[PDB]
């Protein structure tokens, strides 16, 4: 006799009137005229915003820093809308529309002569930030099929996560730091200036603690 | 991409500045060598090719 188990009920979950992802424009409504510096720190280090679920239960977690341009948004919008079930699923954007101006000089120009004109706009994304959040009358296995497909097409490392998997991922990392048998840690050595190591480290390494290098995030570092 | 023609000292003898564009469906051939840079030639060669093929579609 096969042993059956109860199934969860989604009758208490409401679906918005616009389950599909909204269109995202290349540029804001009012174009920007003040050119901005490169400001590479906007994709460096852990994300301090959009790091928690709001309405949905499934999302794409960013495992590294990078810029999203209008090409990536169209890839995300078209794939998710096509592969989702509007009657039981809904998707929302956890990242803003492209707003950071990017300047490109004319092809073949030598160095100098000022700064190039604005070419396109990008959205800076740090590691650990949700990009697209989904939810509704569905399981994680149903949406994991195409969310991972979208995740691997992003300029940064990404992975489809849920409320349970993300909590498990964070709790597993906390367990790794707790039972770490290595007497020496990056945080201890860097903060104490042991061996004069800060002469080769960065001031950001006091808070990154060796888990971040440039735009890259290393989950195996404790 | 091929080397241009003209009295232009050493730059042509090594630099493939001239650009030839061939539209396979129509067979039109557009060549431009006015500018020293290939990219500058390529853009104008495209623009002439666009204009010539603009007439062809009107003819089409």
């Amino acid at each position: 006799v096969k042993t059956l188990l109860p199934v969860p009920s989604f009758e208490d979950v409401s679906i918005p009137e616009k389950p599909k992802l909204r269109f995202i424009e290349r540029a804001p409504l009012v174009p920007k005229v003040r050119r901005e510096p490169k400001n590479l720190s906007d994709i460096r280090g852990p994300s301090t915003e959009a790091t928690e679920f709001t309405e949905g239960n499934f999302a794409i977690l960013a495992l590294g820093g990078g810029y999203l341009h209008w090409g990536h948004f169209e890839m995300m919008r078209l794939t998710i809308n096509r592969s989702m079930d509007p009657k039981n699923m809904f998707a929302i954007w956890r990242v803003p529309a492209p707003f950071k101006p990017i300047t490109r000089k004319s092809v073949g120009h030598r160095m100098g002569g000022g700064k190039g004109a604005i070419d396109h706009y990008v959205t800076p994304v740090k590691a650990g930030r949700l990009v697209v959040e989904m939810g509704g009358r569905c399981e994680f296995e149903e949406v994991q099929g195409f969310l991972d497909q979208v995740a691997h097409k992003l300029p940064f490392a990404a992975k489809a996560v849920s409320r349970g998997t993300l909590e498990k991922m964070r709790k597993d990392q906390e367990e790794r730091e707790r039972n770490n048998q290595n007497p020496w840690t990056f945080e201890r050595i860097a903060t104490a200036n042991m061996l004069g190591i800060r002469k080769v480290l960065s001031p950001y390494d006091l808070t990154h603690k060796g888990k971040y290098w440039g735009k890259f995030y290393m989950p195996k570092r404790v | 991409t091929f080397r241009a023609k003209g009295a232009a000292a050493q730059h042509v003898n090594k630099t493939d500045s001239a650009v030839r564009l061939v539209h396979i469906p129509t067979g039109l051939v557009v060549e431009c060598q006015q500018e020293r840079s290939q990219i500058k030639n390529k853009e104008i060669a495209f623009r002439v090719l666009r204009a010539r093929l603009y007439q062809q579609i009107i003819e089409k």
Partner: peptide
């Protein structure tokens, strides 16, 4: 060799006031 543009920002060469 292409002729490039020019910077439209002038001034701003003041020294520090100490």
């Amino acid at each position: 060799k292409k002729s490039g543009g020019s910077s439209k920002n002038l001034g701003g060469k003041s020294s520090g006031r100490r």
